[PDB]
Design a protein around this nucleic acid. Structure first.
Length: 264
DNA sequence: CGTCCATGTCTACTAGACCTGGACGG
């Protein structure tokens, strides 16, 4: 549900749909409070890309498709249990809340957005979310400048382990990555964000790791897109011998050693 | 049977609220 997972999900969509053609309507579960998706087309291809903790599907009618349709984009957020699956049409998983149906020649499939807890959301419009910062995986430099122009923001008054969840500046970082990131620089989680960030501009540093650590996870591959590969990679989050505490917002921060000055 | 825990926002009056379910304890 963090940046590398969204990025793996979009490569999953792209590779698995490379040679598929979809058709029909875009079907939503009756229980989902997300919008219905007005799209019909006898023949359309699907593609994706990711930005931080969001992923964008593009629906692309082939030439001559009927209903006339222009290409349509949808932006998804995954929450705690979102994912994308390619399953046979009649063996839908439980909680498949939005579904795209392959059209005939071959075996009838469904691409499903699958979300157990329903924390995920989508939106009509292909637009990214407007306050989100740039992607720590795909827009590093921009990510880095956005953080450094804006240290005056009161976001940086908070402890570093909290500011790292703030998607206005660290679009893509979630609770496992903050544990792992901090742990590699041995920065106490409750050190103050502005201090750890001045001392950078204005041996990789904290912002550099915000890119390279989640990039590591992407390079392990997998995740539905093999889970022991990841549990093996983890050095801190959930690990035996690590301390942990609750931040302001009730989220568990895992670490080693000094909790830091702003601890609760 | 029950309590606690989980890769996130979202919304409204920080502190719940939103949700299912697996692990574990009695």
């Amino acid at each position: 549900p963090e940046g590398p997972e969204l990025h793996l999900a979009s490569q999953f969509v792209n590779e698995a749909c490379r040679a598929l053609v979809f058709g029909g309507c875009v079907e939503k579960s009756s229980v989902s409070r997300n919008p219905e998706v007005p799209f019909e087309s006898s023949a359309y291809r699907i593609s994706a890309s990711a930005r931080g903790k969001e992923l964008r599907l593009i629906l692309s009618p082939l030439p001559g498709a009927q209903p006339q349709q222009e290409p349509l984009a949808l932006v998804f957020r995954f929450g705690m249990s979102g994912s994308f699956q390619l399953v046979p049409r009649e063996e839908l998983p439980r909680h498949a809340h939005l579904r795209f149906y392959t059209a005939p020649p071959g075996p009838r499939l469904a691409l499903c957005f699958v979300d157990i807890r329903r924390f995920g959301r989508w939106d009509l419009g292909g637009k990214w979310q407007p306050g989100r910062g740039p992607c720590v995986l795909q827009e590093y430099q921009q990510f880095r400048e956005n953080v450094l122009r804006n240290l005056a923001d009161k976001a940086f008054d908070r402890p570093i382990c909290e500011a790292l969840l703030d998607q206005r500046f660290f679009n893509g970082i979630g609770n496992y990555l903050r544990a792992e990131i901090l742990y590699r620089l041995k920065i106490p989680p409750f050190e103050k964000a502005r201090s750890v960030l001045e001392a950078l501009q204005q041996n990789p540093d904290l912002l550099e790791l915000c890119h390279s650590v989640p990039k590591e996870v992407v390079q392990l591959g997998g995740k539905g897109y093999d889970f022991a590969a990841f549990r093996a990679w983890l050095r801190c989050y959930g690990m035996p011998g690590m301390s942990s505490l609750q931040d302001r917002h009730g989220r568990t921060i895992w670490f080693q050693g000094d909790p830091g000055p702003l601890a609760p």
